[PDB]
Amino acid sequence: DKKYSIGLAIGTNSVGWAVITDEYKVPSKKFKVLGNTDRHSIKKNLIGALLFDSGETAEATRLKRTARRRYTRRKNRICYLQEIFSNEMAKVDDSFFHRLEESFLVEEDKKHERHPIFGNIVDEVAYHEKYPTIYHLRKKLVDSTDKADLRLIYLALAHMIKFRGHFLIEGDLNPDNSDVDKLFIQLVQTYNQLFEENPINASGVDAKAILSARLSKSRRLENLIAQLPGEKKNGLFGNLIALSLGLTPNFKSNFDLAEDAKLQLSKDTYDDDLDNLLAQIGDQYADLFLAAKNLSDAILLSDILRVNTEITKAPLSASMIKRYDEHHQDLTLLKALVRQQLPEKYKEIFFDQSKNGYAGYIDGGASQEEFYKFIKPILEKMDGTEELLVKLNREDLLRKQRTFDNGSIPHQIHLGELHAILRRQEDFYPFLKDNREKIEKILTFRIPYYVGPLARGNSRFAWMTRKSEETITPWNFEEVVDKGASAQSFIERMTNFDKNLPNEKVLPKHSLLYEYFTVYNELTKVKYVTEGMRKPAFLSGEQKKAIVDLLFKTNRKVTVKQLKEDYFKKIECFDSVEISGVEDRFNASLGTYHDLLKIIKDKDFLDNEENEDILEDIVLTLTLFEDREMIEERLKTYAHLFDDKVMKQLKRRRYTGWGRLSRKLINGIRDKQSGKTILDFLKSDGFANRNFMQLIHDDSLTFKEDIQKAQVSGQGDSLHEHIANLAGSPAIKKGILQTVKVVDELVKVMGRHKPENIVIEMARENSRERMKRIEEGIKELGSQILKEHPVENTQLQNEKLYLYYLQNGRDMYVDQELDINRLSDYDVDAIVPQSFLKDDSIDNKVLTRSDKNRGKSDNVPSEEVVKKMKNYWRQLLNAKLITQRKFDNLTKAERGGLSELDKAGFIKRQLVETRQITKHVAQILDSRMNTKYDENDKLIREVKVITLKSKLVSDFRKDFQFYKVREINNYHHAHDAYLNAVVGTALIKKYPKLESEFVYGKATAKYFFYSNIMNFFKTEIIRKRPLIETNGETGEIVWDKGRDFATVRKVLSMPQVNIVKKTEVQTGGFSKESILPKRNSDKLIARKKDWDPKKYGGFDSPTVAYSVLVVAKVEKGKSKKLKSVKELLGITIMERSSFEKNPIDFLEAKGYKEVKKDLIIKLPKYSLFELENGRKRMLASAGELQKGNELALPSKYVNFLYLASHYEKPEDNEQKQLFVEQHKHYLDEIIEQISEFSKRVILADANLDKVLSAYNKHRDKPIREQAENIIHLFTLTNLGAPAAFKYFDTTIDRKRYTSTKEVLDATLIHQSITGLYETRIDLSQL
Amino acid sequence: TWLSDFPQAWAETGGMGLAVRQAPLIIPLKATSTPVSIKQYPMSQEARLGIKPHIQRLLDQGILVPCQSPWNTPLLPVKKPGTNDYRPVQDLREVNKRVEDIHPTVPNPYNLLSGLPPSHQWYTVLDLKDAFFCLRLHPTSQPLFAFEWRDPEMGISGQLTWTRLPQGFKNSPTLFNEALHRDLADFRIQHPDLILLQYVDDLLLAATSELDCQQGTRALLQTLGNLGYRASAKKAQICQKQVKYLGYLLKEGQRWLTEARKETVMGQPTPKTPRQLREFLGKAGFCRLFIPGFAEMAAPLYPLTKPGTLFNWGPDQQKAYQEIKQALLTAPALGLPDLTKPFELFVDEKQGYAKGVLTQKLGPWRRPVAYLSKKLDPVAAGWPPCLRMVAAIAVLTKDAGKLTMGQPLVILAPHAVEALVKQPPMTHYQALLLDTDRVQFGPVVALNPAT
DNA sequence: GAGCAATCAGACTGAGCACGCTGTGGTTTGGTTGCCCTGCTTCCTCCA
DNA sequence: TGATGGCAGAGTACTA
DNA sequence: TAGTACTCTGCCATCAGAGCAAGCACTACGGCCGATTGCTC
RNA sequence: GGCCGUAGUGCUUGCUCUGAGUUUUAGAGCUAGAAAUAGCAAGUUAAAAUAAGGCUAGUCCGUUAUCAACUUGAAAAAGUGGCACCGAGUCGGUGCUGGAGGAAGCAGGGCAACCAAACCACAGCGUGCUCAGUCU
C-alpha cells in the first residue's frame, strides 16, 4: 500500500485521468489479460484518457414528437369532415372518398378509376379547365348563388380545413375593412367630432405610406406623430394610433383615469379591459374605440391581402387568382421576348430541369430566390423588360400560389371564406345548414397549450382529468375535459418542492403566509438602545405584534424613523431610541396585504384567522391561472364572499411568482415540547428572538431532527438519476458520469484503497441569429447602413465585420464614421482590460479606429467620452444592438471606475473556481468517497476533493517549458490530468491555509498574495529562492526543483498512455429523412408496407445500430452449394427489435443457413482490433474501419514545433527565435517520424507520397510557415475517422478503409472504462 | 568402511528417511486465519526445469501428493550458490502470515562454540541431509501447503500438497530442533562422557581420545539410523583433528579462521560505491572477533558508508582499508573458551572507541578468546578520559556476557576507575559493574597495545 | 406650476471610541538542547 | 452547424 | 469471354416560424433616499 | 458589507399551432416522321404519406438519457483480475521463503533545563473618527 492521488480533467467529449504517488511519479503494474490468446499479462502505466461522443439535448426529439401529433390531429380533422359528408356522399358518388384515399397508388394497384373527383377523363379535364387552381373554385363557390356539386363543395371545405392559417391574431377580422388612409381619415374625423375643442387634420400627410412602412411599429408611430400637428407622443391621438397599429398604450393620461388604462386589442382579456374602460368613459369614446378596432383590422388585412374586398367576399382567393393571372401574363410575355430577342437559350431556360430557370423552378427543385438569381442577368441583357425587372425587385414575378410567405394569413380569412361558402350553399343541402356550427368548430378548434395531449393514462407527457370517459371531440371538449384541473396540473407539474421538506409543494411568492413569515423573520432580529438601558434589548413578542399591527398593515414600506417616532416615541414614550441590526428601511413587507386591502375593503376579513385558508386559495388561484375565464370559473365558489365589482377587480389582478418554502415547513410542523410552529416562535419565543436558521439548527428544539429524518428518509436515488437531475448541459452531465465511473475503477485497481487527494478541473466550453439581430437593430434605429451595402450571413460571420455593423459603422469612442472597405486596419479593444479577466465575446469586444481613445489605458473608459458616447449608447440600446451588461460596463466610469477592490476580485476569480457545476461534481465525489462518521456523527474527511482552474496548469506549462499541442495526439488529456494533480497537491502542501477556498468542505495585501501564489515553483524571481521548498511551517518538502522537474519531464514523455474510446450502440433516426424518387435498386426502403420502393420511392442510408459477426453458410451459384462464409452483418436501427426477438429467423431470412448462436458476436461502434505489427483499427460500421493508433512524438519535437509555429502568438522572445534557428533541422526528423509511423500503421501510400512531395517542394519557405503547415500533417496519422487536411497549397483528401474483412482474422479487444483491464478474443479460431 | 557398517544411517544408502519417532504434527492457525489463494507466479524457464526433477523425486518419495485445496501459494526456485539447484521452496508469505507464531529455541552460532571444551580434542562432524523433510505432517494440515504444478510430460495438473514439513515455513527451523533435541537428549544420557553439538541440521561429536570418538560415532550412527534420520556421507568429517564446523576451523582446540575466507576479504579491489564498501565491510565484520581494535581500525570507513554521505574515498579511508587488509593477514588463533575455568578481559579506550581482548589462562600464558571492540555512544564520547573508560568497560562487559555464558571474568584496565564507579565525580552502570557474582576487578595493571 | 433627473453644515473645545504602539503583570502555546527509552527501517554474511 | 458514413458509378481484376 | 467481386472517388445530407409555463446559472445595477438643486414642458 | 430586491442574457424541459419541402398519382399534349428524332404547346393546382410501426386502441406512443468482457441473476443489480525494482517507441525485463549473526540510519514517546510568541487585565501615548457644548 502506498499513498496516491487521482487527477482528473473533464471535457465535453474527453475525460483524462492519472494516478500519482507522493513524489509525483506515475506508477506501473502488470495486468492480467483474459480471453483465449496466449498472452496472459501486460504492463501499463497508470495514466490515460477516455474519449466519447458528445451528448445531445432532447430538442430534436421534442420537435419530432410535436410534428407527429400535428399530423395525427390534421388527419383526424379530415376524418371528421368526411364523416359529416358521408351520408350524402353515398348518394352523390359512393366511391368518392375511396378514390381520394388511394390517390397515392399506381394505376395497376388502384381498385377504382385513376381519376379521383369524377372518375372519367372528360369530366376531369373539364373541371381542370374551368378551375385551374383550387382558389378559382373557392372564389366561384363563395360568389355564385346557384347549386354546386357536393364533391366540389367538399373539396373546397377540405382544403380550407386542412390548411388553416396562423392563430396569432385572436378575436375577429372582418375582411370588409381594407382601406388604409381613407379609414385613417375617417378615424381622424371621428376624433375631431368627439374632441371638438381642438381640431386635428391630416391633410397632405401620407398616412398610407407611414402606416405601411416596413420599419418598426414604434418608428411608424413616431413618424405619424411627427407628421401630425397639434399633438405629440403619448397624447390621445398617439395612444389610439399605437393601439390600432399594435402597441399597447395607457390611456390614463389621456382621460386622467388614475389607473393602468392599458389596452392591447389583440389580447382577449384586454377586450374586457376595454369593456371596463368604456364603462368608465360612458359611450362617447366607445364608438371611437370601435373605429380604432376597424382601423387596425383594415391595416393588417391590407398588409396580408393587398387586394380590394368590396367587389368580392373572397379576398384571399381573389388575390391568389390575381397572382395566377399575373404569372400567366408574365410567362407569356417572357416566352415571346426570349424567342424574339434571344433564341439561343429558350431551351435551357424553359426545358432544362438540371439548371435553374422556369423548368427548374416548376419541375425541378429550384426555389424563388434561385430562379430570380438565374433569370436576372438575362432580363437585364434584354429590351422592354423594365416592368419585369421592377416586379423581380419587388418579389412579385412568376409567383406560385403556395409559397413560404403564406404563413401570414390568419385562420380568420379561411374561416370567413368557409362561412361564406356555407351560407351560399346551405339552401339546397339541409345538412350543410344543420352542420355549419360544427364544421366551423372543426376549422377553428385547437387544443389549449395547458391541456396538453389527450391521453388515457398510457402517456408519460400527459396531464389531464376528464369529467367523463366518452371520446373527446372538438364538439364536446368543454363538456368532457376539466380545463381547470388540467391547468392546475400543468403548472404544479413543473414547479419545485421545498428542500427542507422535499415532499410538499412550494408556496406562491406573493402568498400571505410567506409575507408574514418574511416580515417576522426580519423583525425578530432587531435590537434597540434607549436611555436607561444597560445594553441593547431584543424586540419583545408583544412589541413585534403591536409594530406589525400599526406599521406594516398601514404603510407599504417601513422605515426605522417611522418605527422610532410612530411607536417608540408615541407609545413607548422614549424620545431617545437607537435601533440596531436593521437597515434604515426594511426589506420585507406585506406587499400582498396592501393590494387586497384596497380591493376587498375589509380589514376585519383580512385580519381574521378562520379565512386564512380562503385567502391562500385566492392567491393560489391568481398565481396558478393565467386566463380570465378560468380565474372566474375557479372563483365562482367565492362569488358570495364579494360583490361582482370586487370579483372583477380580483380577476383583473394577476400575481406571478413562486416562493421557496412549503406551507408544511412554515406552519404545519410543531415542536413536541410546546406544539409551536415556526411562525409562532417568530411571533414570540421567550426573549431570545431567534431567526429561522437558528430555529431550524437549534439542537434543543425538535425542528432540526424532524427535518433531517424526513429529508434523508425521502432522499433516495441512483448515480445516473442524480447526475441527470443536476442542472447543466447534457455533454457535461455525460462527462461527470464518466468521471465518476473511472474514479470507481481506479480505486478498484489500486488495491481498493481510497486516494488521499482528488484534483479535478473542467473546461469552460449563429450567422442567421446575427442577421436577424442586426436587421432588428437597424429597423429600430432607422439607419440605412444595410441598405448602403447589403451583407450576407457568411460575410457577417467575420468578427471584424460583425463589430463594424453592430456599431453602425461609427467609432465607439469618437463621433466619427468608419469605412467598411478600409477594414482590417483598425484595432479591437475590450471594454475591460484582458489582464483583469479573459473574455473575447461580443459582449466585451469593441471595434474602434484607434485603441488609444478609451481614456485611461487600463481603467474603464474616460468619463467625458463615456458621457457623450453614453447618450449615443442609450440610443444603441433602445436599438438593442448592445446588451444591458455591455451598456453598464461601458458607462460604469461615470458612477465609478475600477476600484482596487474590483481589481482584487477580478484577479482572485481568475485562480479560484466558483461554478455551481464544479461544486456539484466535487460534492458528488466527496459523498461517494467519504462515508465514515466520527463519535459526534461528523463525516471524517478521509479523501480531500480539490478544484482548480485551467489557468494554473496553462501558466505552469508556459512558464516551465511544457508546451501543449492539441493536434499531435490525444495524450494531452492525460497530461493535463497529471499536471492538475501535481499542481493541486503542491499547492495544498505549500499553503495549508487555502484549503477552505480550494478543498471541498487589506485589499493591497491580498493583491500581491494571490498574484504570487504560484511563485514557489519558480527559481529566480532578482530574488533567488532556495532549491528545496519546505512547507513554510512544518518540515515537509513540497517541491525539490533539482529533480521534480526531471520527473515531470519523464512522465510527460512516456510513450504508453491508455487512450480508450467508449464503444456506443448507435441510436436515433432510422435513416436519412429525404424521400428519393423511384429507381431500380435494393437500397431503397419502403415508406409504407405495400408501397414497393421500385414504384413509389423510399428512404435510404439506414443507420446501423451494431454489427453482428455471423458464421454460417450461404448458397452461391446455380448449384446452390453451401460455401462456408464468415462475415459482418449490420443490424440497422429499424430492424434491431426484430433481430433481437429471433436472431435465428432474422439471419435465415437474409440467406444464411445453419448459423451458430454461440459464435454470434455483437460488435458496437468503435470496436478495436489489432493486426500486423501493432496496427489497430476501430469499427465505424459493418463496412468501414477507423484508425486506432496514436503517435508518440518526442517532447523535444513537440516543443520545437510549438515554438516555431508561435502558438498563441523581449530577451525571452529573443532567445526563442535563436533556439528555433539553431534547431531548424528538427523538421526533417519530424517528417521522418510521420513517414515511418504512417508506413507502419496508417498504410496510406498515395497520401504519404503526396505529403512527402509537397514537403520537398516547400522546403525553402520560412521556418515559421513550415512548422505551422507541418502541424496540419498530423491529421494523416491520427485517431478516429480519416479526414482531409492541407499542406500549403496542396490538399490531401480522405483515405477511407471501406473494407472490413481483415478484421475477421484480427484480435478483438474488450477494454474497460480505463483500458487497464482487457479481454483479448482471437477471431481466427472461429 | 563406515558406509558398510551403518546402512540405515547414511543418506546415500537409506535414501529419503522418515521421522518414525515423532507423530504427525498439526500446524495451528491464527485466530483470524481465513483461506487465501494466489495464482502461481510464472517461473523462469531454466528455473522451471530446475525444480521439475525434484518434483518427480518428491512425488516418488510420497512427500508430494496430488490434492485439491483452497490454500495455494506459489513455489520459489532458490538457486543454490553452487550451480543452480533451484530448491523448491514455497513463497509461503500468506501461510506464514496466517499461521500462528510460537516461541523459538534455535541456538545462535555465537554460543554453540562456547560449549565446546578444549579437553575434547577429537571431533566428528555429521550433517543430516533432508533434515526438515524427516518430520511427517498430519493430513488435516496438509492442505495448508500446496502449489500448482502442471507438466504435460507428467500428465498431472493441479495442486501438490506436502505430506512432510517443507522449507520456508517460519516455524520449521524451531520444531525440528525441538523434535531432534529430545532424540539426541537421551543419547547424551547413554553417553554422558561425549559432547555432542546439535546444530539445526549439523551434528558435531566431540570426544576425549580417538577411541572415544570412534565408540561414540558408531553408537551415534546406530541411534540416528533407528530414529530414521539420514546423514550425507559425501561431506562427513569422521575421526579427524581438522574439521570444519559452523564456518570455523577446529584444530588443537582453537577457533581458527579458514584460509579461503581471508582470501575473499583481501581479494576484492578498492570499493568505489557505498554498495561495494558495504560488501567489503560485511565480509570484514564477520571476522571482527579476530582483529584487535576493530572498531577504531575501521572507524573511517563507517561514515563513508553513511546512508546520506558522499563516497569521496578519503586517504584516512585508504589507511583504514590497508589496516583491515594487513590485520586479517596475521590474524591470531582464538582459543575455544573453557567454561570450567574463569575468564579474563582486558579493556582499553582511546579516542571514543573501546577496544579489548577476552583471554583465558593457557599454561603460564594467556590465550586470546575473542577481541571485543565498540564505538562509544555520543553521550559518552564527550566524557572526560577518566569517565570514558568506565563506559568502555560497561560496553565491553556486556559483549563478554554473550560469550562467557554469564561466567565472571577479571576486568583488567590500566587505570583504577573501578573505585571511581563507587564515588563518581550512571546508576545502571553501577549495577552492571558492581555485581560481584558476575563481575569483579583484579589488580590494576596496564596492557600491551596489541592486546 | 408640474414633472423628470440627479446628488448620495463650517470652525473651536470636551468625552467617548477605533487602530496602532508601549510599559507592567498573569496564563497558554510553541520552540531548542540534553538525557533517556521504544520502535521502525536498511545494509552486508552463513545455513535449510 | 461541420462531420462522417452511405451511395452510385467508373475502373480494374479474378473466376467459371 | 461474361459474370461476380473489390477499390476508388465525388456527392450527399428537412427547413423556417409563433406563442405559453417552469427551472437554473450569472452579471448589472440599485437599494436605505430627503431635501435640495438642476433643467424642460 | 450583509441582506433585499429587481433588470437583463444564456440555457434546459414540457405543451399547443403555422408555412413550406419531398414522394406517387390526376390535370387526354399536338404535328411530321415506321422509328429513334425534330418542331411547337403546356407549366402556378390537388389527393395521400411524412420516421416502418405498436397495443394498451388513446384525437395515445415511436429519434433524449443509459450500454467493455465473463459469472450469478427474471429483472433491478452484485461479484471476477499479486507486489517491488531497473528500464522505455505504445510497454520490456528481473526479483520474490525463513532462521541466525554483524553494522548503520531513521522516526516517535517520556522526562528536566533555557528561550520565543500569543491571549487577557490595568495604565499611558500618536493618529483618526463619532457624539455633546460654544461661535458661525
CB-CB neighbours of A976 under 10 Å: 25
Q: Which of A480, A488, A484, A482 is nearest to A465 (CA)?
A: A482
CA–CA gap between residue B401 and residue B345 (Å, rounded): 11
- What are the CA-CA distances from residue A326 to residues A137, A333, A1061, B124 (Å)? 18, 10, 62, 136
How many angstroms is C1' of F129 away from CA of A581? 21
Residue A995 CB-density burial (10 A; 0-12 exposed, 13-18 middle, 19+ buried): middle
Q: What Å value separates CA A986 and C1' C43?
A: 33
Distances (CA, A) of A1283 to A728, A844, A1236: 32, 35, 20
If one counts every other C-beta atom within 10 angstroms of the C-beta of residue A753, the result is: 12
- Whether B248 and B268 map to the same domain: the answer is no
Which triple of cell numbers denotes residue A1109?
Answer: 459477426
Q: Which three cell numbers stand for residue A649?
A: 377587480
Please give the C-alpha separations between residue A586 and each of A246, A557, A559, B74, in angstroms, as whole numbers: 41, 7, 6, 79
Nucleotide nearest to B93 (CA to C1'): F97
- Is the C-beta atom of B178 closer than 7 angstroms to strand C? no
Same domain, B149 and B73: yes
* Closest residue, by C-alpha, to the C1' of F66: A720
Task: Note the strand E nucleotides within 7 A of protein beta carbons.
Answer: 5-10, 12-14, 16-34
Which protein residue has its CA closest to C1' of F90? A1056
Q: Which long-range contacts (CB under 8 A, 24 or more apart) does A144-152 make?
A: A144/A424, A145/A424, A147/A425, A147/A428, A148/A425, A149/A92, A150/A85, A150/A88, A150/A89, A150/A92, A150/A429, A151/A89, A151/A92, A151/A93, A151/A96, A151/A117, A151/A118, A152/A117, A152/A127
Label residue B92 exposed, middle or buried (CB < 10 Å: 0-12, 13-18, 19+): buried
**Same domain for B262 and B198:** no
Total count of domains within chain B: 4
Pairing, β A1058-1061 against β A47-51: parallel
Instruction: Answer for the pair A548, A563: CB distance below 8 angstroms, yes or no.
Output: no
Beta-bridge partner residues of B412: B346
CB-strand contact A1134/F, under 7 Å? yes
Is the CB of B182 less than 7 A from some atom of nucleic acid strand F?
no
Contact B141, B161 (CB under 8 A): no
Instruction: From the CA of A133 to the C1' of C1: give the distance in Å.
Output: 69
Which is nearest to A416 in space by CA: A80, A179, A175? A175
Query: What would the grid cell of residue B408 be?
Result: 565472571
* Residue A1144 approaches strand D within 7 Å at CB: no
Q: Is the CB of B208 under 7 A from strand C?
A: no
Q: Assign residue B77 the CATH number of its domain.
A: 3.10.10.10
For residue A987, count CB atoms less than 10 angstroms from its CB and return exposed for 0-12, middle for 13-18, buried for 19 or more: buried
Query: Which of A975, A948, A955, A967 lies closest to A1049 in space, CA to CA?
Result: A975
- Residue B182 and residue B272 in one domain: no
Helix, strand, coil in percent for chain A, rounding step 5: 45, 10, 40
Dihedral over alpha carbons A108, A113, A115, A116 (to 10 degrees) = -110
Nucleotide nearest to A1101 (CA to C1'): D6
**Which strands, in side-by-side order, build the sheet including A577-580?**
A537-538, A527-530, A577-580
As given in the structure block, the three cell numbers for residue A1230 are: 519530424
CA gap A143, A154 in Å, rounded: 16
Task: State the amino acid at position B380 in one-letter form.
Answer: A
Contact between the CB of A1281 and strand D at under 7 Å:
yes
Taking the C1' atom of every nucleotide in all shown strands and the CA of A328, the nearest one is F44
Resolution in A: 3.2
Residue B292 sits in the same domain as residue B415: no
The grid coordinates listed for A930 are 467519504
Q: Using the CB atom, is residue B275 less than 7 Å from strand C? A: yes
Q: Which of B220, B255, B290 is the last residue of a domain?
A: B255
Q: CA(A108)–C1'(F30) in Å?
A: 27
Nucleotide nearest to A1104 (CA to C1'): D5
Same domain membership, residue B290 and residue B415: no
- Indicate whether B335 belongs to any domain: no
Residues B197 and B248 sit within 8 Å (Cβ to Cβ): no
Nucleotides of F under 7 A from a protein CB: 1-5, 7-9, 11-28, 41-53, 56-70, 77, 81-105
Q: Which domains does chain A have, with CATH numbers?
A: 1-53+729-762+915-1057 (3.30.420.140), 59-167+411-460 (no CATH), 181-305 (no CATH), 318-401 (no CATH), 495-714 (no CATH), 767-895 (no CATH), 1187-1298 (no CATH)
Q: Which residue is nearest to nucleotide E22 (CA to C1')?
A: A494
- Cα-to-chain-centroid distance, residue A431: 50
Whether CB of B261 is under 7 Å from strand C: the answer is: yes
Out of B267, B299, B329, pick the residue that ends a domain. Answer: B329
Question: Rounded CA gap, A1294 and A816, in Å?
Answer: 50
Identify the H or E element spanning B127. strand B122-127
Q: Are A932 and A939 in contact (CB under 8 A)?
A: yes
- Domain-located, residue B450: no
Q: Last residue of some domain: B298, B329, B360?
A: B329
Q: Does B407 lie in the same domain as B296?
A: no
Q: Is residue B389 part of a domain?
A: yes
Angstrom distance (rounded) from CA A1167 to CA B45: 36
For residue A356, give Cα distances in angstroms to A361, A406, B132.
Answer: 7, 23, 102
Q: Quick check: A63 CB within 7 A of strand D? A: no
**What single string gives the DSSP state of each residue in A461-500?**
T----BSS-SPP-TTSHHHHB-HHHHHHHHHHTTS-B-SS
Looking at the C1' of nucleotide D16, which residue has the nearest alpha carbon?
Answer: A1117
- How far CA A409 is from CA of A169, A309, A316, A345, in Å, comes to 10, 15, 9, 38
Of A892, A1126, A1112, A911, whose CA–CA distance to A998 is shortest? A911
Q: Which amino acid is at A218?
A: S
Cα–Cα distance measured from residue A41 to residue A34, given in angstroms and rounded to the nearest whole number: 9
The answer to whether residues B86 and B123 belong to one domain is no
- Please report, rounded to whole angstroms, the spatial distance between the CA atom of protein residue A367 and the C1' atom of nucleotide F23: 18
In a domain, B4, yes or no: no
Chain C bases near protein CB atoms (7 A cut-off): 34-37, 43-48
Cβ atoms of A398 and A330 within 8 Å: the answer is yes
Q: Say how far A579 CA is from E31 C1', in Å.
A: 19
Chain D bases having any atom below 7 Å from a protein CB = 1, 3-8, 16
What CATH number is given to the structural domain containing B277?
A: 3.30.70
Residue B126, domain extent: 109-132+172-255
- Determine the nucleotide nearest to B201 by Cα–C1' distance: C48
Q: Which of B290, B182, B276 is nearest to B227 (CA)?
A: B182
The rounded Cα B77 to chain-centroid distance in angstroms is 24
**A1237: part of which helix (H) or strand (E)?**
helix A1226-1237
CA of A814 to C1' of E39 (A): 27
Which parts of B221-340 are beta strand (E)? 238-240, 243-245, 248-251, 254-256, 334-335
Residue B312 resides in a domain: yes
Residue B1 within any structural domain of the chain: no
B127 and B243 both lie in a single domain: yes
Experimental method: cryo-EM
Q: Which nucleotide's C1' is closest to B261 (Cα)?
A: C45
Distance A489 CA to F60 C1' (A): 19
Of A975, A956, A967, the C-alpha closest to A1207 is A967
Quote the strand ranges of B257-412, DSSP E: 334-335, 343-350, 353-362, 365-375, 409-412
Instruction: Tell me the three cell numbers of residue A712.
Output: 434523508
CA distance A1097 to A106: 12
Here the CATH number for the domain that contains residue B210 is 3.30.70.270
Alpha carbon distance A885, B327 (integer Å): 91
State the nucleotide closest to A916 in CA–C1' terms.
Answer: E25
Hey, is A663 helix, strand or coil? helix
Location of C-alpha cell 560485511: B282
Q: Give the number of other Cβ atoms within 10 Å of residue A543's Cβ.
A: 19
Q: Are B96 and B169 in contact (CB under 8 A)?
A: yes
Contact between B243 and B165 (Cβ < 8 Å): no
CATH number at residue B437: 3.10.20.370
| A51 contacts A730 by C-beta, under 8 angstroms | no
CA dihedral of residues A274, A279, A282, A286 (deg, nearest 10)? 20
Across-strand partners of A5?
Answer: A20, A757
Residue B15 lies in a domain: no
Contact A1077, A67 (CB under 8 A): no
Residue whose Cα is closest to the C1' of D3? A1283
The per-residue DSSP string of A2-38 comes to: ---EEEEEE-SSEEEEEEE-TTS---EEEEEEEESSS
Task: Please tell me whether any atom of strand C lies within 7 Å of the Cβ of B281.
Answer: yes
Q: Is the CB of A708 under 7 A from strand D?
A: no
Sheet holding B353-362, edge to edge: B365-375, B353-362, B343-350, B409-412, B439-441
Whether B28 and B146 share a structural domain: yes
B250 within 8 A of B256, measured Cβ to Cβ: yes
Instruction: Convert A998-1021 to b/e letters by CB count within 10 Å (16 or more is b).
Output: bbbeeeeeebeebeeebebbeeee
A1120 grid coordinates = 446452390
Q: A727: which nucleotide lies closest, measuring CA to C1'?
A: E24
Q: Distance (Å) from CA A399 to C1' F27?
A: 20
If asked whether residues B389 and B287 sit together in one domain, one would say no
Same structural domain, B226 and B364 = no
Contact between the CB of A841 and strand D at under 7 Å? no
H/E element, A736: helix A730-749
Q: Per the domain annotation, does B238 fall within a domain?
A: yes
Establish whether the CB of B85 is closer than 7 Å to any nucleic acid atom in strand C.
Answer: no
Q: Does residue B428 reach within 7 angstroms of strand C, measured from its CB?
A: yes
Q: Could you give the residue ranges of the DSSP H alpha helices within A196-314?
A: 207-211, 217-226, 236-245, 252-255, 269-280, 284-305
